Design a protein around this ligand. Structure first.
Ligand code: NI
Ligand code: NI
Lengths: 211, 142
């Protein structure tokens, strides 16, 4: 029984970050930590798979902690290599029972942290495309995921309030493509991405290709 | 104030504000051919933008019996009105919910219904130990 902070992390330039683990328990716990890599993320083809600790892109020190009652610990996470493009991982935190100080079906809650292994120069580049069935397709040409908040299928070239604001809220990861589920005859499209602090807002528009 | 870089947390608690337990036993009773449900309401403690929390479990849980693994009796686990599959279930905040606290992450007040099941419907029960575990996994999505 414990809690971790935080549950999502970005890692750039080879610098480590820490995930902290806090016990809510009166009994001493034993915690093991393991990393899975996320393949074809953002897609319907997204799955997880176990990787090793130093050659898979993530360095996790340590992977086993004795966590005394009410104690807290730090786990270090750093990238092995700096990738050419964004890779994404999940780091699991699990109470292992050597012992943790009808029947019993003990409940083991597990937390996993989403880790973004980021490239040196974050570059965002989007492509436009038309499907078979001529749905409109967005492709990620950049080395970093593209968080799409809202897409503007403008009738005109410019953003009149007649255009159809369709919300997608989806991350399009590099080398991958995304279906707008729109085949209609829009002239130009406008895409809105996410920001809060520091990382620099931009806005972008891409011409439709005909059906 | 000054960042305070990271902004995402998850902590699952009872809606009491109290902790979940390690082990749980359903009372074993016929009740006109039924098995009672270990309901527990929940809190989910998270910072704003929490809402994209996903929940999938490590493996399909089993009543586990070494000496006899012969027969297994199903277990169905409901959260937010949805069953819980080894397949990740995208959730929205599911707090109901939305409030703001610059000092606090505001709760998500509803019930987890672990409702153990039978292999065939309307079923006469077998006899045995049925030990076991249920791993539960909280994360965010890509
Ligand atoms: Ni700093
Ligand atoms: Ni965020």
């Amino acid at each position: 029984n414990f809690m971790i902070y935080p549950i999502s992390k970005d890692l750039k330039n080879g610098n480590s970050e820490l995930v902290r683990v806090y016990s809510k328990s009166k009994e001493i716990q034993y915690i093991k930590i393991y990393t899975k890599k996320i393949i074809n993320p953002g897609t319907t083809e997204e799955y997880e798979v176990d990787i090793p600790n130093w050659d898979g892109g993530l360095v996790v020190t340590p992977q086993k902690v004795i966590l005394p009652a009410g104690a807290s610990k730090s786990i270090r996470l750093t990238q092995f290599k700096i990738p050419k493009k964004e890779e994404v991982y999940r780091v699991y935190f699990e109470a292992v029972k050597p012992d943790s100080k009808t029947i019993e079906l003990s409940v083991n809650i597990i937390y996993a942290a989403l880790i973004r292994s980021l490239p040196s120069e974050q570059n965002i580049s989007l492509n436009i495309s038309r499907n078979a069935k001529k749905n409109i397709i967005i492709y990620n040409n950049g080395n970093v995921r593209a968080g799409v908040k809202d897409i503007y299928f403008c009738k005109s070239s410019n953003i009149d309030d007649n255009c159809v604001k369709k919300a997608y809220n989806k991350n399009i990861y590099p080398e991958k493509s995304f279906d707008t589920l729109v085949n209609n005859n829009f002239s130009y499209v406008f895409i809105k991405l996410n920001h809060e602090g520091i990382e620099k807002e931009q806005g972008l528009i891409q011409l439709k290709v005909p059906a | 104030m000054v960042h305070h870089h990271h902004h995402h947390v998850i902590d699952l608690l009872q809606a009491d504000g109290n902790a979940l337990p390690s082990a749980v036993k359903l009372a074993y009773s016929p009740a006109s051919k039924t098995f009672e449900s270990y309901r527990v309401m929940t809190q989910v403690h998270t910072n704003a933008d929490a809402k994209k929390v996903i929940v999938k479990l490590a493996d399909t849980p089993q009543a586990t019996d070494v000496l006899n693994s012969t027969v297994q009796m199903p277990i169905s686990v409901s959260w937010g009105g949805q069953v819980l599959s080894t397949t990740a279930k995208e959730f929205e905040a599911a707090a109901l919910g939305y409030s703001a606290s610059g000092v606090n992450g505001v709760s998500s007040s509803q019930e987890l219904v672990i409702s153990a099941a039978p292999k065939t419907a309307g079923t006469a029960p077998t006899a045995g130990n049925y030990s076991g575990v249920v791993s539960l996994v909280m994360t965010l999505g890509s």
